[PDB]
Amino acid sequence: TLCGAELVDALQFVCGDRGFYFNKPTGYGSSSRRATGIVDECCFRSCDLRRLEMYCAP
Amino acid sequence: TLCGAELVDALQFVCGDRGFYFNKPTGYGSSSRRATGIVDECCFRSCDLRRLEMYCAP
Amino acid sequence: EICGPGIDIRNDYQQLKRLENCTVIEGFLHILLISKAEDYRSYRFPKLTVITEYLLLFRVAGLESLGDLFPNLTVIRGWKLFYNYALVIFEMTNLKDIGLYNLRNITRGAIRIEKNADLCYLSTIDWSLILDAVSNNYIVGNKPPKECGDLCPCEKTTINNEYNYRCWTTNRCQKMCPSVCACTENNECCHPECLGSCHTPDDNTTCVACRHYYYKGVCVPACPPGTYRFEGWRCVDRDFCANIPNAESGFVIHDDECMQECPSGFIRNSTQSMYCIPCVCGDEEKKTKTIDSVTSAQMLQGCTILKGNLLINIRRGNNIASELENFMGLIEVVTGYVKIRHSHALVSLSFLKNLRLILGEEQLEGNYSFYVLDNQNLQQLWDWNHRNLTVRSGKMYFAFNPKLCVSEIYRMEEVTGTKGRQSKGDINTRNNGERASCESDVLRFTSTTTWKNRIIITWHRYRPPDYRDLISFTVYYKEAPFKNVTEYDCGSNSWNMVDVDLPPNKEGEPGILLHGLKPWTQYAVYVKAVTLTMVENDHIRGAKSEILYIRTNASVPSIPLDVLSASNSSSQLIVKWNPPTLPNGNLSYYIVRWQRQPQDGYLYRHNYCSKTEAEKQAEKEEAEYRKVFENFLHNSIFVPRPYPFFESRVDNKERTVISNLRPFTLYRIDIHSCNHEAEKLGCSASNFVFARTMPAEGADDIPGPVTWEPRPENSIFLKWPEPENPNGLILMYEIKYGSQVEDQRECVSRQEYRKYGGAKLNRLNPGNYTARIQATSLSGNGSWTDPVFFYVPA
Amino acid sequence: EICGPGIDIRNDYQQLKRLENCTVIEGFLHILLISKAEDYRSYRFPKLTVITEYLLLFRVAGLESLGDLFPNLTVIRGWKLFYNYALVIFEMTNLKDIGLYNLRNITRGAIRIEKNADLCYLSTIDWSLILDAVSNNYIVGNKPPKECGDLCPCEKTTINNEYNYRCWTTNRCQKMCPSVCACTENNECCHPECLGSCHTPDDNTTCVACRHYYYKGVCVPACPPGTYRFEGWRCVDRDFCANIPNAESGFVIHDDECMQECPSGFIRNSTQSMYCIPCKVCGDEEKKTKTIDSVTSAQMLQGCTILKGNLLINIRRGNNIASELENFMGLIEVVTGYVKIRHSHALVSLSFLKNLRLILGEEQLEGNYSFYVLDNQNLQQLWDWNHRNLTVRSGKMYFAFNPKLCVSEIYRMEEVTGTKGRQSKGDINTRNNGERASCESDVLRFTSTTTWKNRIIITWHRYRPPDYRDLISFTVYYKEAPFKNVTEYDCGSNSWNMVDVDLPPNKEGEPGILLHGLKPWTQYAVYVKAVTLTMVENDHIRGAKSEILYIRTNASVPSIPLDVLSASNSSSQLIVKWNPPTLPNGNLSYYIVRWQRQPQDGYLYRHNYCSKTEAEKQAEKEEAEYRKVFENFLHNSIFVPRPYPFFESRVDNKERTVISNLRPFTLYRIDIHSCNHEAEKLGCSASNFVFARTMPAEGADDIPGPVTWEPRPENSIFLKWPEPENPNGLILMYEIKYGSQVEDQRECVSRQEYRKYGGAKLNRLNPGNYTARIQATSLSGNGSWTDPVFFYVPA
């Protein structure tokens, strides 16, 4: 399993110039979603490259 | 409440020359009864004279 | 210009161009994960000067400082915090120094910069003036200060330990204001409604970004009724926050303020949806809302009924219970359990003053509708007489809270109505509040007696309901010269355990003796009655004694130090002392005595004129074993029926004058230091010192004619008196003698003076004798008198 | 005569009359609560000598000692104990001393005398000679030894601290036997089958009461088949224990012994009810719970197969009584109810319940608990091994406060018994369950190590838990252990030495550690523990420990020798001794002891005179957890899914060595130097030079030739002679004389004028005859008065 700094490092290693995707909505206020999402998906279970690279901007 | 040294000191003070009753059976082996009986009756609840003096030989 | 509703920068340096054309931005400002491959062009952004909420910097590659991109940023409001933090700088590379010189004040949050192997210039810059709560900061894991060694080209002020300069970088120091009072560019106050920097002082329309509000370029503590607040920073009309692209997935005006949503009972008015009329949160999917910090706490602001779970983990913070009660003390019923884990920043759970009912529809494992754990400071729950609370169903748990007193949890358990649903397995007492006890049985001190170094204390015989429970008494004493004493266990001036045995079968008053005690000290002493609780059987609150301050008897002080002697003038011998190291009582007066001492016998008779845990547990087990054996015995046995000395008294000052001063005299002086209990004790020891006064003889010549007497064939006999006050004593009287002038040295000794008067040299050459006489003493050659014309005939 | 089945004395001293006519009391003997009003009449009972079960004494008023009433009691069998105790004396009044002189042995129990403010004579008497397991004794609360101060008119044996007389009372010591070999009256060993005392030795029918059995006045290790055992003391015939007034509320024979009942599956035979036939199940249905505290409460359960109740074990103290326990409880296979265990500090392992296989748990504790432990200070290892099966039909399971029980053990037992879905961290925790002792953990391998005289550097392989972000802090412990038996539990009183080392930073090599200020040449025991946090409980995580490593540091130069003394025994024979240094710093190899003859004093030559505390540890753990949770939140939030030369010598065997060239009165430079085994590279010790002046010697201290004279112008006495080369150090004041007819007035012929010319000179001296009284004096004083030398001026 990988947790902490490794994550972003591994993340960088899988994206490079591709960039990181963001669902940029405009919205207003705290109604738009909130602040598990990653550490559930990577820190508590080993995440394969198939499950991880999806966070990369196209 | 009273437990231990008070008990006998109370018990003697109740009986004096009367003596303590014993159900002396002959029997054989451990089958005859067993080895709570007093501290349940006195140490965990206050015991008055009416409840306590009964342990006295007639 | 104002940019909304929040800007994020990711993977593209050119995205900085989105900040080109707005002086203010409302919304979060993220700059995260920027590759250094892009040519750093020093993208100056003087327009951006204030950000409504937190600023997040995460792994920007190739960025060198912060002045190069944010030169005019002056205050961050931090309306919408980011995990207790308003400006976070995480994993910085190439960022050697921070260039946010224009920054002046951060309202809400606390700073946090860490894990940056190349960044420095932090201990130089002080935050307390800029940040209103410095104690919540977190700056570690950066360049160590020793390995950094910063320097500044900004005055010296004390950062909690010492004065030093405050320096943003190698180029520029921070800006502050004189003690006159906001601040302008040049050391002068501004309008009260201003914030940070100013264009011209004492104006409402020239503030760079003004505090407490803003509107149409002017500032006011309460903007007009035609305007409504916006994120605590702007005021806008209806036409602004009515057609605003809300996309909440418009705004409603409550109390002349337009926000996203109305409290329960208030709903959008029909055909007037931008207004509220009188006539609730909680996600149904996650059903559990972990509360880590004021971000997760703020997202619940204005929630009435929570349909889910509460899981409070507040790991650290300053007195943030204020914020917690502000944005969370509005819930009245939680459908599920309320777990509290590791929340070490909650000295009391009182911030939920509006909670009354815990439905607990779905519980934890084993039907738990309440749960605490490891809370190192939950010192007092809020279950007071002023508060009511009900648990509809489910058990309740407690563990590891070292300050939460057991009486408190029992009170809350009986108040909430879960008495039948508990067990000693859940709510224990071996760890709950083991470090803090609120009340106990009163231990009254029966009597006490004191000595100079001995104390005896007797207390009334404590008797637990079962007298055999070892009432083992442990006395703690501390040399406390004050009243503020903490009653927790030792060693370095905290307390000192001394165990005293149980009262033996001599049932009077148990007592304790203390010896080896420093006299005249305020000891804080008190006894704790440790007893075994036997089987669980809850309760048993032990027995505590009132902390007693006792002052021991006085004793003799030590000999004074700084004891010296000196001479300045006749009949004036100064002698000095100092208060003793160990007075043992308030000093009252000094008796100082001096003795004139006799001369030397050899120099005169011979004339020379020519409880560690393991054993505590063993003791507890022993005491339990005794009880169990006796109970078994009672059960098995019984069965139911069917040259004198002069004194003086001087205490005001150290240097004390002494009379009777003759030059070059040896005097011994004794000093005593009497305390303010000298009436019966007496005084101190004797501090004695010998001293020789100044040498002085002047013209210590013969007090009369130096008469010459002849003899048979010429000899020089003399007769004279003796000088009464020489420089100590005559040693070598430098008379002379010669054929025509007295040139060959002569010692007309005081031996022959006391015997006959003078010397004798039979058959000496006759002639005239012009006497070169010097008055000498033991100090050496003294006063050379004039040629004395006491001559042998020529 | 044998008294049975047991005698109680209460509230009447005269009831002692019931003990008049029997010599053995099979059963228990109580004497309790006797009023002192009845006078003491010296109720000698020499008939009573042995009692099968315990003897209880409780508050006998007016009783003075025990010899008066029990003179011949020689052995108490203790078949049926009394709360681990075979003879108990409680709350004694008027009892100054114990007079049980005839007592020799007690088989089962342990003694217990307590709370008797008038009684003494206990530390005098040794119990190991009478009872076999001393450690289970209990003697507290009696007369303090200082306030007692006993004396005795019977050897002296060290009772764990020192020897002293073993004296029963002021009248008589206890009796032992000679080491040659039972024991008779007079220091002789009896028949082996005997027990205690014997009338005549090597006899099977003259034993007072013989061990291992008894029958018809004779003794035998295994009584004949026609007889059956009775309380492990008697063998009776068929008729005795058949028509016996049992009143169980007869006896059945198994294995040629008759007891009360039969094991499950064995039942009284039809028409042969005194016999058994194959084809227990005890447990009271009313109490439903059988508190277990001692072998008195455990023996009643012996011979039981199925327990229809609750087992509640708490045996607060004892020696290895698990051996006893497995005999009485190693026969139950199923308990209907739960099994609680409290305060049972005497159970290092509960293996004695081997035959237990199923716990029905029909009715449970609160919260449906069918198993429960608590506060067991030594339950170091449960019995759930691969050799045994165990099932819990229903109910949860609990654990707490056991400071030695390892978490791996309880996890193994819970997965074996089949309760995995029924547990939680709330029940079976790990903060207090065995935090004082762990057996298995992650292996830490030492990568490398280097050493110095006082410096050590250790490197270990990087340890990465599943979440490397965990505070993997390393605590190295080191002790000066010159042995191999080392305990690996926490410092302070020389137990260990805590040192914390930082985490491996983002320089990901081998996280090392430096130790300095270390004593050279020592077998340090060093090992590192990997302290880590766990965030959510999630159980497991066994930490990581390293093998306890023994490292011998490099040595240094030894210190100076001790007992540095030099003495003279003969010419060219100077003895000088030393001693091994206080800190040798390495194994010694040899000594380089060298001496230098020293020049004499220059002023005599130039001027010849012939004329972590828990709080900060928890704070550190909390800080690490805070860092981890914050950056986890950060990663979660930002991302988003897409849609005078010197002479040496080498002597080391003995301390004192001999030096040659002992010129009289010559200071030397005997420098001792203790070289260690590494002398070739290390060197010797510090300098230990000694200035040893040799013995006096004069020999021919007189003039080495004729003492000649010389006349001059008007009489002056000149002298001529050579100078001795071996004086007593150096000539000081040469005692010759001179006179008119006999030399009477001393003539101090100094060596100064001798060196210049040869003698003195006194112009115009009175002539006459001279008889020289010459003494060869040196700096030591007047030397040897030589004979009158007849050198003279003419008369």
Residue numbers in the entry:
A (entry chain C), B (entry chain D): 4 to 38, 41 to 63
C (entry chain B): 1 to 153, 162 to 189, 193 to 260, 265 to 294, 301 to 510, 515 to 635, 679 to 710, 750 to 901
D (entry chain A): 1 to 153, 162 to 189, 193 to 260, 265 to 294, 300 to 510, 515 to 635, 679 to 710, 750 to 901
Copy text from the publication.
The insulin receptor (IR) and insulin-like growth factor 1 receptor (IGF1R) are a subfamily of receptor tyrosine kinases (RTKs) and have pivotal roles in physiology. Unlike most of other RTKs that are monomeric in the unliganded state, the IR family receptors form a stable dimer by inter-protomer interactions and disulfide bonds, independent of ligand binding.
Here, we first determined the cryo-EM structure of IGF1 bound full-length IGF1R mutant (four glycine residues inserted in the αCT; IGF1R-P673G4) that has been shown to exhibit reduced negative cooperativity. Through the mutagenesis and binding experiments, we also showed that increasing the flexibility of disulfide-linked αCTs by inserting four glycine residues (IGF1R-P673G4) reduces the negative cooperativity of IGF1R that allows the binding of the second IGF1 to IGF1R. The subsequent 3D refinement of this minor class resolved a cryo-EM map at overall ~4 Å resolution. In this T-shaped IGF1R-P673G4/IGF1 complex, two IGF1s are bound in the top part of the ‘T’, in a similar fashion as the binding of single IGF1 to IGF1R-WT. In the small population of particles, however, the L1 domain together with bound IGF1 moves to the top part of the receptor dimer, leading to a stable T-shaped symmetric conformation of the IGF1R with two IGF1s bound. The structural differences between IGF1R-WT/IGF1 and IGF1R-P673G4/IGF1 suggest that the disulfide-linked αCTs is the origin of negative cooperativity in the binding of IGF1 to IGF1R, and is critical for stabilizing the one IGF1 bound Γ-shaped asymmetric conformation of IGF1R.
